Amino acid sequence: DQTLKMIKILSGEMAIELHLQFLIRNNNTDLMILKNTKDAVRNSVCHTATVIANSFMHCGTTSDQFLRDNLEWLARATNWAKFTATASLGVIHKGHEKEALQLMATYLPKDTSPGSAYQEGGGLYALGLIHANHGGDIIDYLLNQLKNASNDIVRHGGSLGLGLAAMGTARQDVYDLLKTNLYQDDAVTGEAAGLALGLVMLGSKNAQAIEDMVGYAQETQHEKILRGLAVGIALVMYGRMEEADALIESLCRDKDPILRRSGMYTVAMAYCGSGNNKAIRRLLHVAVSDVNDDVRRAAVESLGFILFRTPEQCPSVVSLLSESYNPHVRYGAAMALGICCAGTGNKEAINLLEPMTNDPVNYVRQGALIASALIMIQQTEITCPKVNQFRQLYSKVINDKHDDVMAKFGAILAQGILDAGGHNVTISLQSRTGHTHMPSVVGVLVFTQFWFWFPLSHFLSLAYTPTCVIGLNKDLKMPKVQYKSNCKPSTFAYPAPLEVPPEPNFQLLDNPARVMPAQLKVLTMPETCRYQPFKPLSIGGIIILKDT
Amino acid sequence: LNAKVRLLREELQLLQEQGSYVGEVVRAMDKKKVLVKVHPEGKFVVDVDKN
Amino acid sequence: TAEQVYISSLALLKMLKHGRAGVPMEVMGLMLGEFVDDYTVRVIDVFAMPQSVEAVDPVFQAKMLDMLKQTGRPEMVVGWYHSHPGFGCWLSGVDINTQQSFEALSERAVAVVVDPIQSVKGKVVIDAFRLINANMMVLGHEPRQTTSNLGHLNKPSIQALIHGLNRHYYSITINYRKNELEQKMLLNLHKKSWMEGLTLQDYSEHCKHNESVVKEMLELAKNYNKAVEEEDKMTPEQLAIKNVGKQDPKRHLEEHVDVLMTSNIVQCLAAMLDTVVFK
Amino acid sequence: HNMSVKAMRFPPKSYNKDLESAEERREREQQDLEFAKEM
Amino acid sequence: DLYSRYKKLQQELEFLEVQEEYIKDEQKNLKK
Numbered sequence: 051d052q053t054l055k056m057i058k059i060l061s062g063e064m065a066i067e068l069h070l071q072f073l074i075r076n077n078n079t080d081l082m083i084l085k086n087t088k089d090a091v092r093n094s095v096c097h098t099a100t101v102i103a104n105s106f107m108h109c110g111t112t113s114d115q116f117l118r119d120n121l122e123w124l125a126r127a128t129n130w131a132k133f134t135a136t137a138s139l140g141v142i143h144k145g146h147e148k149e150a151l152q153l154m155a156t157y158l159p160k161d162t163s164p165g166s167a168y169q170e171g172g173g174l175y176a177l178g179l180i181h182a183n184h185g186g187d188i189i190d191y192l193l194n195q196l197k198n199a200s201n202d203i204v205r206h207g208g209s210l211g212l213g214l215a216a217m218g219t220a221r222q223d224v225y226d227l228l229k230t231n232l233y234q235d236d237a238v239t240g241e242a243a244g245l246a247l248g249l250v251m252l253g254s255k256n257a258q259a260i261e262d263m264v265g266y267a268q269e270t271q272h273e274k275i276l277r278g279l280a281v282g283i284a285l286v287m288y289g290r291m292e293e294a295d296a297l298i299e300s301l302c303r304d305k306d307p308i309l310r311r312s313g314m315y316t317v318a319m320a321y322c323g324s325g326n327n328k329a330i331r332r333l334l335h336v337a338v339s340d341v342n343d344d345v346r347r348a349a350v351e352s353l354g355f356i357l358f359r360t361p362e363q364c365p366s367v368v369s370l371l372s373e374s375y376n377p378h379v380r381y382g383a384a385m386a387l388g389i390c391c392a393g394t395g396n397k398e399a400i401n402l403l404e405p406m407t408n409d410p411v412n413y414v415r416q417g418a419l420i421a422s423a424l425i426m427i428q429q430t431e432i433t434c435p436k437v438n439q440f441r442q443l444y445s446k447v448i449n450d451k452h453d454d455v456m457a458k459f460g461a462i463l464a465q466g467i468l469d470a471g472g473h474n475v476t477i478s479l480q481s482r483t484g485h486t487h488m489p490s491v492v493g494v495l496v497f498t499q500f501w502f503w504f505p506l507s508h509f510l511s512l513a514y515t516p517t518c519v520i521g522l523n524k525d526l527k528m529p530k531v532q533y534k535s536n537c538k539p540s541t542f543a544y545p546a547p548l549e550v551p552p553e554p555n556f557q558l559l560d561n562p563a564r565v566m567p568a569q570l571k572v573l574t575m576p577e578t579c580r581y582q583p584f585k586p587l588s589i590g591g592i593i594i595l596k597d598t
Numbered sequence: 599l600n601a602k603v604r605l606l607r608e609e610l611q612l613l614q615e616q617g618s619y620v621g622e623v624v625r626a627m628d629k630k631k632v633l634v635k636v637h638p639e640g641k642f643v644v645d646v647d648k649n
Numbered sequence: 650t651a652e653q654v655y656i657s658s659l660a661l662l663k664m665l666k667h668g669r670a671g672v673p674m675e676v677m678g679l680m681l682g683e684f685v686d687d688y689t690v691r692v693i694d695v696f697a698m699p700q701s702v703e704a705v706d707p708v709f710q711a712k713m714l715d716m717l718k719q720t721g722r723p724e725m726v727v728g729w730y731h732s733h734p735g736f737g738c739w740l741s742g743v744d745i746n747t748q749q750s751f752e753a754l755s756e757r758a759v760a761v762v763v764d765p766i767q768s769v770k771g772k773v774v775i776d777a778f779r780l781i782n783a784n785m786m787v788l789g790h791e792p793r794q795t796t797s798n799l800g801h802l803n804k805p806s807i808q809a810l811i812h813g814l815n816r817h818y819y820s821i822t823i824n825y826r827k828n829e830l831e832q833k834m835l836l837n838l839h840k841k842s843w844m845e846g847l848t849l850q851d852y853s854e855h856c857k858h859n860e861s862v863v864k865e866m867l868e869l870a871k872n873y874n875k876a877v878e879e880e881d882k883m884t885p886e887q888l889a890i891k892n893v894g895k896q897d898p899k900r901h902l903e904e905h906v907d908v909l910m911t912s913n914i915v916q917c918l919a920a921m922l923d924t925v926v927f928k
Numbered sequence: 929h930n931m932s933v934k935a936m937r938f939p940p941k942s943y944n945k946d947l948e949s950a951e952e953r954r955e956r957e958q959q960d961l962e963f964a965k966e967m
Numbered sequence: 968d969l970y971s972r973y974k975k976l977q978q979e980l981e982f983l984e985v986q987e988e989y990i991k992d993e994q995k996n997l998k999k
Contacts, residue, residue, distance in 0.1 A: 094793055130794050237688050271685050273651065305827055327981050331988065338993045363982060373945060375604050375997075408951035410958070412800050452959055456800040502651065502795050599997060601946035608948055615957075810965050 058525070062184070066145050068592065072518050072562035073111050078472040080547050083107075084116050087462050089449055097127035098134055098504060099459045103466030105138035109475065109511055110145045117142075132169040133207065134505050140176025140211075141511045150180045159204070171204035175505075178211020182512055183489055185219045192216075196227060202239035205231070209239075213246025214509070217492070220254045229262070237272035241503060244278015245496075248285025252492065255293070260286055264300075267309060276308045277502055284315035285492065294320040302332075307342035314345055318352035319495065323486055325359050343378040344501075350382035351498060354389035358479060358486060364390040365398040372402060380409065381417040388421025389494060392477045394568065395434040399425050407443070412454040419444075419457065423464035428476050428517065428566060430543035441468070473545070474564050475514035482589045490515065519573070520592035521561035523581060529595055531581045532558035534574035541569060565590065650790055651798040652688040653779065654822035655727070655759075658831065660695045661773070661823075667697050668732040669765040675702050677731035679710055680761065681717070681724040690727050690757060702731075702743050728759020737806055738762045738776040739813040748780055760819070779818040789816065849919050855912060862905050873898040 301313030406418035493512030500507035682692035760778035876898035
């Protein structure tokens with residue numbers, strides 16, 4: 051009703067359940083790629099790589115087979131990978147309401163309470179992942195669960211999930227409890243506390259919080275809490291375009307390298323995508339004049355965030371930076387290409403990252419691999435002919451025992467990237483309204499921080515967006531309309547798993563049907579059917595179909 | 599200039615590689631094998647590189 | 650395991666001094682600071698003991714700590730060091746059969762090894778191992794969650810992999826927060842007197858030095874004339890296989906003439922920087 | 929002198945890029961080093 | 968065709984100018 055209209059326009063529900071319905075009807079995944087990646091059995095990294103990859107490819111689909119196939123291998127890695135697994139369980143069941151608390155019934159801290167407290171802490175991390183950008187009873191539940199707690203090994207996941215859920219809300223009390231969580235002066239709670247304050251105060255300009263954290267940033271000694279505040283300073287400023295200039299000047303002129311890295315992240319984050327030459331002058335320049343490698347890498351990373359409007363100039367400038375003497379600068383160049391063109395495959399980016407995988411430095415190979423994964427997304431090999439070439443190169447490097455374990459770790463997470471949501475959700479920080487998806491931006495920002503915390507870069511589920519036209523005539527009733535296409539149906543090509551030992555363009559598509567954004571111009575509008583789109587059909591998502 | 603410094607920055611790497619023996623050929627045989635003596639030493643069959 | 654790198658400037662200076670002093674033996678000593686937290690330990694003071702490799706008597710370090718208690722701030726024994734001259738900065742069997750005794754004394758394994766020889770005037774070579782261990786054959790160390798202490802650093806040298814235990818660790822980095830006061834205090838080590846900065850050297854050796862350089866420029870001119878005169882089409886690659894002899898055309902030029910100019914011009918400039926104010 | 933110095937660099941383009949090593953050669957050298965680590 | 972071409976020409980002009988100002992200071996740093 052018009053009384054119920056406010057819920058229909060403001061609660062954000064029906065988008066979530068119809069995305070869920072689309073992914074659970076369109077579940078074009080692959081059971082066997084996990085079996086291929088299972089070959090490199092080791093006790094160090096493979097468990098982590100697999101548990102992030104299968105969560106990446108099966109996000110929100112609630113498919114319990116990749117963890118239900120085995121249990122002894124599931125718990126073979128301990129004390130950090132069980133935490134990663136109970137983290138990944140949330141991404142598997144993200145965008146849900148009911149089967150969140152109830153499926154973790156085995157994983158309550160008070161139901162079993164074994165000697166391991168890490169698996170029982172990341173359940174709250176999973177809960178925060180599921181209900182990200184969705185306040186309510188989740189907020190109160192997490193607040194009450196953080197009212198009393200053990201030592202902070204259980205409080206990492208709870209703190210990060212609480213920051214994930216109440217991120218845009220800017221609730222006062224959660225910030226108040228994070229304040230005393232930060233003032234514990236403890237290393238283990240440093241990652242717990244420094245992140246989520248920037249989470250909750252995103253764009254709030256709560257200047258008291260900035261003053262408190264920058265005062266805190268000058269006496270503590272824990273590296274972890276320095277990193278937490280370093281990303282918090284970035285995540286407190288957003289899109290002001292003029293206000294953090296004193297802030298970025300203060301954080302850039304200081305001698306502290308981690309705080310200079312924070313300053314580079316601030317000038318990235320308060321200047322989302324803007325083509326401000328004046329910013330890029332000082333930013334790029336101190337990308338060279340600096341001395342510490344980490345802040346140099348952050349400075350060259352910030353270029354990818356700052357060029358959404360016309361991302362085709364970034365290859366031209368950073369092609370030279372890819373040939374720098376410094377492997378850190380080359381790695382930053384690789385990820386900068388990966389994140390600037392986070393969308394449609396561009397031939398220049400693929401060509402420039404083609405030799406980047408062959409450098410004899412492990413981490414620049416990591417950057418090249420992940421950049422290659424993100425540039426080629428949902429591509430049916432006709433957009434760029436390199437899709438299967440990178441797939442077979444990935445398949446070659448996963449089963450080689452000679453390459454470094456970091457590089458193959460990046461390769462398995464690349465397979466996680468390519469098949470995300472059954473190739474139905476993709477990485478696109480841009481709306482069709484000329485606006486940048488804020489949760490995608492913050493998710494891909496946190497995703498860059500896998501140097502120092504592997505499950506922290508688990509925060510990428512906020513970046514996946516489905517690419518599917520959805521049809522709905524009334525509030526709830528699904529219609530039944532199937533239209534055609536005009537171009538080559540090989541643009542509709544799927545991976546089509548082989549396991550081996552005259553062309554119709556009228557591809558009929560139902561209401562929850564996937565489509566590439568580039569294919570949005572070549573769809574057939576429903577004309578002979580009883581339905582007809584009230585709005586002209588050039589945008590994705592869900593569109594009104596008036597019935598005749 | 600980048601090229602130059604890169605070469606020099608990799609110079610101390612390549613110089614880490616050990617030296618290479620010298621030898622005197624006598625004759626070769628089939629399947630790309632060659633008989634070469636070292637100077638106060640014996641005679642080795644050596645497989646030739648593809649270049 | 651991103652918890653390494655505890656270096657401080659005065660410590661490294663004392664360690665290069667102590668290693669360079671007695672070179673033909675493996676010297677050793679103790680290094681003390683504060684265990685500020687689990688991921689980081691700060692060092693403030695470092696000392697050595699005489700020996701004639703052998704562990705020091707506890708009496709020596711006991712009285713050393715006893716007088717350092719009132720000597721400024723209190724100290725905590727945070728570890729120790731040794732050298733390995735002309736080596737790959739690697740742990741020995743003698744080192745490892747006392748490292749676990751040190752671990753029994755204090756769990757934080759400080760296995761600093763320093764070398765003055767590979768530490769060249771530009772680049773310095775350090776390691777500080779963290780109890781390279783082989784207790785169990787299906788586990789490594791407890792933290793494996795970041796690539797900063799695992800992939801960011803350079804991979805170890807081949808010989809350190811050979812004669813060292815292959816379960817290697819550690820990430821030595823200067824990590825002393827770049828103390829600006831002592832940085833500005835040290836700065837130039839080759840500043841002279843201000844009143845020395847206005848000196849003139851002398852005019853006589855200036856002129857005979859010029860005379861000395863003119864004859865070598867004449868000879869360089871002769872060589873240059875011959876080398877332009879040959880102008881062979883033998884290709885510069887084959888020109889560079891026969892340049893190993895005495896032939897050095899244009900291979901000096903600059904090395905005297907700017908040396909000429911920096912001889913002349915400063916002698917010119919200081920000739921006029923002391924005139925209009927001195928009467 | 930300055931005019932000659934400036935004019936020296938204006939023609940010689942088409943210098944491609946830096947050629948450090950080959951990926952196959954580097955991989956083979958690393959594999960030989962790792963295999964001879966016990967040796 | 969009209970108008971917007973002038974704006975994109977001027978846009979790549981200051982973009983190119985940013986690269987020009989960059990190339991000097993990076994050359995100065997890389998020499999030393």
